[PDB]
Amino acid sequence: KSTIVDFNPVETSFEKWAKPGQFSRTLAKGPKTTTWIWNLHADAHDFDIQTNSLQEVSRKIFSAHFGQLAVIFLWLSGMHFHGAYFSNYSAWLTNPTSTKPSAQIVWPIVGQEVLNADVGGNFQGIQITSGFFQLWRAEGITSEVELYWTAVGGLVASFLMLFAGWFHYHKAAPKLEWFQNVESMLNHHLAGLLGLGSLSWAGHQIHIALPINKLLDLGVSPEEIPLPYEFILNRDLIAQLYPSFNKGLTPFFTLNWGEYSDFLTFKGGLNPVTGGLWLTDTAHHHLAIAVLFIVAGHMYKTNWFLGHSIKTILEAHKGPFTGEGHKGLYEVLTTSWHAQLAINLALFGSLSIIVAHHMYAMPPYPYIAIDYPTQLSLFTHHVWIGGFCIVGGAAHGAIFFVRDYNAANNYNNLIDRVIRHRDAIISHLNWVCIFLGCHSFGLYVHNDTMRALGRSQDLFSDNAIALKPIFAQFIQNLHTLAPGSTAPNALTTVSYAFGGDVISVGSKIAMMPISLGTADFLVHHIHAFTIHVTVLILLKGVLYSRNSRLIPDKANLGFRFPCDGPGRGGTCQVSAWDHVFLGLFWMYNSISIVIFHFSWKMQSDVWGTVSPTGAVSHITGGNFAQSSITINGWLRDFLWSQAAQVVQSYGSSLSAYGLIFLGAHFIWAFSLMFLFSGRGYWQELIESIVWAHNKLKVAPSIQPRALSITQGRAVGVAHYLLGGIGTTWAFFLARIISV
Amino acid sequence: DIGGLNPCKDSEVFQKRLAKTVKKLENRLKKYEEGTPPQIAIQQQITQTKQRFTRYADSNLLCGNDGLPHLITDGRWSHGSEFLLPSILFLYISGWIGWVGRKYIRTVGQTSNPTEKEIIIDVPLAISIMTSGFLWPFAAWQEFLSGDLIASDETITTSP
Amino acid sequence: GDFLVHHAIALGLHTTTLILVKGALDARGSKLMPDKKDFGYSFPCDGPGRGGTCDISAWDAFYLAMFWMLNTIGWVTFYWHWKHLTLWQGNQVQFNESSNYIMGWLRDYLWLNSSPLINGYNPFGMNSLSVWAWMFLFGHLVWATGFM
Amino acid sequence: SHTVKIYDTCIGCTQCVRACPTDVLEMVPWDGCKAGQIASAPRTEDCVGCKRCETACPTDFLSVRVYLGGETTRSLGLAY
Amino acid sequence: KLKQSDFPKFEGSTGGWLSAAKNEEKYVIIWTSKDASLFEMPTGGTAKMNAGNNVAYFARKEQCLALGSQLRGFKITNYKIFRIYPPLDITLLHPFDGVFPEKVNQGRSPVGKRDASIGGNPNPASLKFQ
Amino acid sequence: IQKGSTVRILRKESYWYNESGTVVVVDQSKVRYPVLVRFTKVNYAGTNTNNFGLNEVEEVV
Amino acid sequence: YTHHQYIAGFLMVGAFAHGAIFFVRDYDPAVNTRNGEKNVLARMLEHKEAIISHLSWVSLFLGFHTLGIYVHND
Numbered sequence A: 001k002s003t004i005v006d007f008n009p010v011e012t013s014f015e016k017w018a019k020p021g022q023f024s025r026t027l028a029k030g031p032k033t034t035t036w037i038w039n040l041h042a043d044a045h046d047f048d049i050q051t052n053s054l055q056e057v058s059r060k061i062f063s064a065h066f067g068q069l070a071v072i073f074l075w076l077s078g079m080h081f082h083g084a085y086f087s088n089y090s091a092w093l094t095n096p097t098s099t100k101p102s103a104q105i106v107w108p109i110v111g112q113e114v115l116n117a118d119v120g121g122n123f124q125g126i127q128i129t130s131g132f133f134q135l136w137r138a139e140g141i142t143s144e145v146e147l148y149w150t151a152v153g154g155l156v157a158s159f160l161m162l163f164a165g166w167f168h169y170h171k172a173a174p175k176l177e178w179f180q181n182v183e184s185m186l187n188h189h190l191a192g193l194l195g196l197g198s199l200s201w202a203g204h205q206i207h208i209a210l211p212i213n214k215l216l217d218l219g220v221s222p223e224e225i226p227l228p229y230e231f232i233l234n235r236d237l238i239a240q241l242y243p244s245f246n247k248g249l250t251p252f253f254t255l256n257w258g259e260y261s262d263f264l265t266f267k268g269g270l271n272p273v274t275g276g277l278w279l280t281d282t283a284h285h286h287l288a289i290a291v292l293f294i295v296a297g298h299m300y301k302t303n304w305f306l307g308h309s310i311k312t313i314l315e316a317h318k319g320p321f322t323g324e325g326h327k328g329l330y331e332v333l334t335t336s337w338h339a340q341l342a343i344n345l346a347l348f349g350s351l352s353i354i355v356a357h358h359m360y361a362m363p364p365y366p367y368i369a370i371d372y373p374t375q376l377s378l379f380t381h382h383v384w385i386g387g388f389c390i391v392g393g394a395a396h397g398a399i400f401f402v403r404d405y406n407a408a409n410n411y412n413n414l415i416d417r418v419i420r421h422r423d424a425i426i427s428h429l430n431w432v433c434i435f436l437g438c439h440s441f442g443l444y445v446h447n448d449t450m451r452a453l454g455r456s457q458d459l460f461s462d463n464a465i466a467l468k469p470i471f472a473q474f475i476q477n478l479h480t481l482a483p484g485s486t487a488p489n490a491l492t493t494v495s496y497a498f499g500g501d502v503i504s505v506g507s508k509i510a511m512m513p514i515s516l517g518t519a520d521f522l523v524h525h526i527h528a529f530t531i532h533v534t535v536l537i538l539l540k541g542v543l544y545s546r547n548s549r550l551i552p553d554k555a556n557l558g559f560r561f562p563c564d565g566p567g568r569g570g571t572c573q574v575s576a577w578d579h580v581f582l583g584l585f586w587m588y589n590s591i592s593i594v595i596f597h598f599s600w601k602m603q604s605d606v607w608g609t610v611s612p613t614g615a616v617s618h619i620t621g622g623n624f625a626q627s628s629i630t631i632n633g634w635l636r637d638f639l640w641s642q643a644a645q646v647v648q649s650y651g652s653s654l655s656a657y658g659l660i661f662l663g664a665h666f667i668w669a670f671s672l673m674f675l676f677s678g679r680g681y682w683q684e685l686i687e688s689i690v691w692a693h694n695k696l697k698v699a700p701s702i703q704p705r706a707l708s709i710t711q712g713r714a715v716g717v718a719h720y721l722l723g724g725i726g727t728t729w730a731f732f733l734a735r736i737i738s739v
Numbered sequence B: 001d002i003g004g005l006n007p008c009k010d011s012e013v014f015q016k017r018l019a020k021t022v023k024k025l026e027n028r029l030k031k032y033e034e035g036t037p038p039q040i041a042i043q044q045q046i047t048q049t050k051q052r053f054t055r056y057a058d059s060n061l062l063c064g065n066d067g068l069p070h071l072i073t074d075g076r077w078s079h080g081s082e083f084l085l086p087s088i089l090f091l092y093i094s095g096w097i098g099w100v101g102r103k104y105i106r107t108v109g110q111t112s113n114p115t116e117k118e119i120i121i122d123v124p125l126a127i128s129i130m131t132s133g134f135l136w137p138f139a140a141w142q143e144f145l146s147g148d149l150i151a152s153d154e155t156i157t158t159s160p
Numbered sequence C: 001g002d003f004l005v006h007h008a009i010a011l012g013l014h015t016t017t018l019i020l021v022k023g024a025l026d027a028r029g030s031k032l033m034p035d036k037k038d039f040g041y042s043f044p045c046d047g048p049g050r051g052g053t054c055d056i057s058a059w060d061a062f063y064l065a066m067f068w069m070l071n072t073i074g075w076v077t078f079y080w081h082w083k084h085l086t087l088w089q090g091n092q093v094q095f096n097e098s099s100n101y102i103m104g105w106l107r108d109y110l111w112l113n114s115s116p117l118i119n120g121y122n123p124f125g126m127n128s129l130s131v132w133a134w135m136f137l138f139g140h141l142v143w144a145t146g147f148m
Numbered sequence D: 001s002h003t004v005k006i007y008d009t010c011i012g013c014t015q016c017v018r019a020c021p022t023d024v025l026e027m028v029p030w031d032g033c034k035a036g037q038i039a040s041a042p043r044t045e046d047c048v049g050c051k052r053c054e055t056a057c058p059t060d061f062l063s064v065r066v067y068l069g070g071e072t073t074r075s076l077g078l079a080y
Numbered sequence E: 001k002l003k004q005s006d007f008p009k010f011e012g013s014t015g016g017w018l019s020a021a022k023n024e025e026k027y028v029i030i031w032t033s034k035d036a037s038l039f040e041m042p043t044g045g046t047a048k049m050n051a052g053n054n055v056a057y058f059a060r061k062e063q064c065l066a067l068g069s070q071l072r073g074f075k076i077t078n079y080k081i082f083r084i085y086p087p088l089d090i091t092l093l094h095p096f097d098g099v100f101p102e103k104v105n106q107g108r109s110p111v112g113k114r115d116a117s118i119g120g121n122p123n124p125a126s127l128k129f130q
Numbered sequence F: 001i002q003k004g005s006t007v008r009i010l011r012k013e014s015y016w017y018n019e020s021g022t023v024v025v026v027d028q029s030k031v032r033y034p035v036l037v038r039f040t041k042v043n044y045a046g047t048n049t050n051n052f053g054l055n056e057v058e059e060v061v
Numbered sequence G: 001y002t003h004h005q006y007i008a009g010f011l012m013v014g015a016f017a018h019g020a021i022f023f024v025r026d027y028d029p030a031v032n033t034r035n036g037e038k039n040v041l042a043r044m045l046e047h048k049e050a051i052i053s054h055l056s057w058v059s060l061f062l063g064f065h066t067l068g069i070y071v072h073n074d
Ligand code: CLA
Pocket: A061, A062, A065, A066, A069, A178, A179, A181, A182, A184, A185, A188, A189, A191, A192, A193
C-alpha cells in the first residue's frame, strides 16, 4: 500500500489481445465497415479518449515510454552487433582515411550481391553513412569483441526496459501525484540524468577514450594497445601519455585544478591528425557540463524547505502589458500531457537542428570530417528529425488547445491574451511571410530573368548589385579574433568555419572558412521566409483551433475533423489538424531547401582536396557563388549536375540508390492521387466494384469504404513526405558516395 | 526467325555481353586476395553468370540486335515455355487463391458474426478451405452449372 | 520498348475512359448520392455526412480525368519524341535498349536531352534557346502553384 | 440564400433542429409519424449551407435536404 | 471601465465585430445568470458573466447561437438573440415564439415540406428554361 | 407482413434497395411509413434500420 | 505532333464531360423508355456497374502488369 504506486492494477492476460479495439468505446463493438480497421490504428495511442482518468493516461504513457526505450536499445544492440560481425571496423581502424566504413553485407540472391561494394579492407558490403565507426573509435573501441559485448548489453538493456514497462503498468503503476512531481522530476533529470551522465562520460573519456585515442593517433596499432581496463588498474599506462595522473586525485581535492591541464585542455579548432575535436577538450567540456547540470538540479523544491516552487515563480511574472502573466501555466503543464509534448517536441526538434549544425561545424569524431557521406547524412537526417519534431510540437499544442484547454482556469493569463489578439499576430505574420517571400524568391526570379535577357550587370550577384551579409561577416570576424582577445585561454577558434586555416587530413579538407557572399544572403532569407510560413500555418492552426469568425464552435468539432461543410463558401480543412498537414508540407519544403543549401555550399566551397603546395580544389569548383543565385542555376548546376551519379548508378554497387530514386519518385507521384482527389469518387467506384463482387457472391461482410477525408489527407501527406525525402536521400547518398 | 530475331546460341552480341560481364567480374576479382570470402563470392558470381548465359543459349530463346532474349508470346507452342506455361501456372495459382477466398467469405457469411470472422480468421476452417482449392477449375465448373456461382437480382443498384 | 510503351498508353487510355465513363454514368446518382441529378453537373460536394462526399459531382470526374489525360498524352508524346530523337540522331539502338526500363527513360530521354535546354542561359552567357529555358522554369512554377 | 426542403420521411427525431448552428430549422406539429412532429425550414435566410442538419438525419436517404444557391453575407458566414 | 454595466467582464478581443456590424447588421444576445461564471467568448477568450443581466453584441447570428449553446452548459436557458439593423431596428430571432425550435409549439406551420420522399423529385430535363 | 418477416426493399433511393431485411414492427396507426425494417449491412451513415411504406417493401416467400 | 496530341486529349475529355452534362441536365428516361423496356441509351445505365467494374479491371490489369514488367527490367 505504497503512497506513490498502486499494486497489481491490471492483470497480465492475453484475453484483450484477441479483442481488437477493446480500448475504444466505439471500436469495441466490432468492425462493420473497413473504416473500423483504419480507426483502430488511428486511436491506438490516443490514450485521452480511452480513459477518463489522467492517472490511467499517465501510466499508459509511462509504459509506452519504456517500450520505446526498449525498441531504441534493441536498435542500438543491432547496430553494435552488425559492427561486430558484418563490418570491416578492424580494417577501418588501421586505415581510416582509405577504407570506407561498411557494416551491412547483402545476401547473394536474385543478383542483389552487386550491392556489396568495394569498401576496402578486404571487405564487401554497403557503405555506412551513420558514422558509427568514427563514434566507436572516439569511444576507444579497438576490437570487434567490444562491439559484440556492447550489443549483448544492449539486448539485456532492451529486455530490462520491456520488463520495466510491464512492471509499471501491471505490477506497480505510479499514482498521479508521483507523475505531477514536476519539481522532483526536473531536479532528477537535470542532476542525475544529464549531469551524472556527463560526469560518467567524462570519466570514461578520461580513463579509456583519452589514452586509447592518443595511442591510436600516435600510430600504435590496435592489437598492441592495452586493453581498456589496464588503463585503470595501472596508473602508469595513462601517466605516460598524460603525465598528470602521477599526482592522483590530490590536485582535485586540494583545488589545484591547474595540474590537470594535461588532459583537461581548452584548445578549440581540430586535431590535426584526425580532423576531429580534441578529445581532451571534449572531456573537459563534459566535466563542465556535468558540474553545471548537477548545480542546476538543486533548484526546485521537492521534499525539504529548500528550492523553488515553479508555481510561485510563474505567478510572480506579471506585467503591465500581460495582465495576469504566467498565472495558471503551472496548472496547464501539470494537468495536460499535450502541452508538455508540444513544448518538449518543439524544443527537441530545435535541439536536433542545432546538433546538426554543430556537428559539421565542429566535427567531434576522429576521421569523420573527411568522410563526406557521413557528414552529409548526419546533417540531413538530424535536420529532418528536427523539422518533424517541431511540426509535432505544433500539432500537440493545437491538440492541447482543442482538448485540455480550460477557459475558466486561464482568465486573463498569457494564453488568454494571446487568443484575444490572434488576429493581429496572424495578420502581421502573413505580412511578414509575403514580404520575405516576395523579396527572397523575387530576387531569385529577377536574377533568372536578367540572366535570360542577357543583362548580367543587373543581377543580385557579387559582380553586380551586391547584397553582402555584413552582419554575419562581422560575427565571423569576431569569432576568429576570440582566441586571445575575448577567449584569452583559447588557442584556436571554436570552428574554422568562422575563419582561420584550411584543415586537411590525408589531402582531404576537414574544415575551412565558409565565405558568406550575396549567394548566402539570398538562401538565408529563403530559409527565413520558409520558416516564417511554416510558423504561420502552425500558429494559425493552434490559435484558431477553438473558434473563429467562420466556425464560432470549432472546439466542439474536435482536433481532427475534415470540415464543417460546403457552406460559408466552403469550410474545408478548417481543423487544426489540417494545419498540421499543410505545415508538414511546408516543413518539407523548408528542410529540403536547407539541406540543398548545405549540400551545394559544402561541396562547392568547403569540401575537396588540398594539393601539396596548398592549392584548394573543391568537389564542384566554386560554382555556388555565381550559379546558386538563379533558379535555373539550382536546376542545372546542382540538381541536373549532381543527379548524374544517381542516374548512372545502374550496374554498379550504387544501383540500389537509383532504384530507390525511382521508387521514391513513384511514391511521391502516388501521393498526388490522395492529395488531389476526393472521397466521393472513390466511394462511388467502390460501389461498382462491390456490385461485381456481389454478382460473384464474394462481397466481404466487412463493407469496404473509401478512406475518410482526414485519412485521405494523412495518406497523401505521408506518401508525399516519404517520396520526397527518399528521392533526396537517394540523390544525396549516391552523389556523395560516388564523389 | 520469328519477327526477324535469331537464336541466342548464334547471336554474337550475346556472347559479347557474356564476355564483357565475365571480364568485369574478373577485374573486380583481381583486387582481392587469395581464397578470401570476397574472392569466393566473386567466383560464384562468375560461375552463375556463365551458367545463366549457357542456359539462355540452350533454351530456344530468340535474341534481337541487342543480344537479349526476346519473348515470343503470340501463342505458338514452340515458344510455349516463355508465356503459355507460366500463364497456365499463374492461372491455376490465382484461381486457387480466389476460390479459397470466395469459399471462406461465403462460409463465414452464414454464421452469427460474419464480420468478426474476417479480422479474426477461423484458422481451422481457413486451413480446411485453402487445401481444397486444388479442384478450383472443377469446383467452378460445378457451381456455375448449378447456378450457385452468380447472383441474379438481389444485387443492389443505384438510383438511375 | 514499343510493346511496353504501347501497353502503358493502353493503360492511360483505359483509366481516363474509366474516370470519364464513371462520371458520366454516375452523374444522375449513385448509392452515396441517389439524387445527384438534383444538384446539377458541377457542385462542390454533399457535405461531410455519410462518411464524406468530396469530389462527388460529375464535374469532379472531369477534373480528375484531366490529370490522367495529361499523363497519357505525356506518355504518348514522350514515346514519340524519344523514338524520333533516336531515329534522327541515328542511335536507334539507344532507344531499343534503354526504353525497356524506367531509369532508361529518365536518364537517356529527360536527363540527356535536357542539357541543351537548361544551358539556354548560364553565368557565362545565353543562346537563342534562353527563352525556352525561361519557359521551362515558368512551367515548373505554374505546375507547383497548381499544386498549391 | 440556400434552399432547405423537408420530406415526409421525417420521423421527428429533432436531431436536425438541435444541430443547426444558425437556427434555421424548427419542429412543427404533424400527423405523418409516431412523434407527431416534422422539421420545418422557416428561416432559410440564415442558412449557411454547413449541412450539419443532414449529417444528423437518421432516415435512409435523408428527410432534410440542403440545396446550395445564391450567396449572401449571411449565407457566406462573413463576420466582415 | 465598460460602456454598459450589463456587459460581461470581457477585456476586449481583436475578433469582435467590424465595420460590417455598423452599416449592415449586428446581433445582440441577452441573458440573466445567477452566478458570475467564467465563460469562453465565441470570438476571443475568457469573459466573466454578471450575476444578473448580461448583454453581448456579435457580428453573426452563428456567434450568438454558439454563445447560447455554451450557456446551456451553465444551466442558462433564458438567453435571447436579436438582430439589429444599422439603426435601432431590433428583431427577436432565436426564441421566435418563446419556445426553442427543438420543442414542438402550436401555431407553427410547416415551411419547405414536400409530401414525398427524395425519389419523387422531378427529372431535371423537365425543368429546363423556367 | 408482420414482425420478423423478410421483405425486399423497393425504394430506389435506399442503401438497401433490392436487398432483403427483417421487419421489426409494422405500425397500425395512420403513419406514412409504418414498416420498420432492420438490415445486417450498415448504410453510409452507420444506421442499420429504416422506416418504409407498405408499397416500398415486398415480402420474400 | 505534340500540339495535335494534346488537342486530341482535350477534345476527348470535353466529349466525355459533355456526355456527363447531357446525362445530368438533358437526359429524359421517359423518352428513352417504351412500356418499361429501355432503349439502347437507357440500357447503358442498367449495366453501368458492369461497365465501370470491367473498366476498373482492365485498368488494374494493365497498370499492375506494365508497372511490374517495367520495375522488373529496372
Ligand atoms: C537520477 C534519477 C533519474 C534518472 C537517471 C532518470 C532517467 C530517466 N527518466 Mg526519470 N524520474 C525520476 C528520476 C530519474 N529519471 C524521478 C525521481 C521521477 C519522479 C518525478 C521520474 C519520472 C519519470 C517519468 C514520468 C518519465 C521518466 C523518464 C526518464 C527517461 C527519459 C528518457 C531519456 O532521456 O532516455 C535516456 C535513457 C537512458 C540513459 C537509458 C538508461 C536509463 C536507465 C533506465 C536508468 C534509469 C534510472 C532509474 C530511475 C533507476 C530506478 C531503478 C529501479 C530499480 C528503482 C530516463 C531514463 C521518461 C521515460 O522514458 O520513461 C521510461 C518518462 O516518461 N522519468
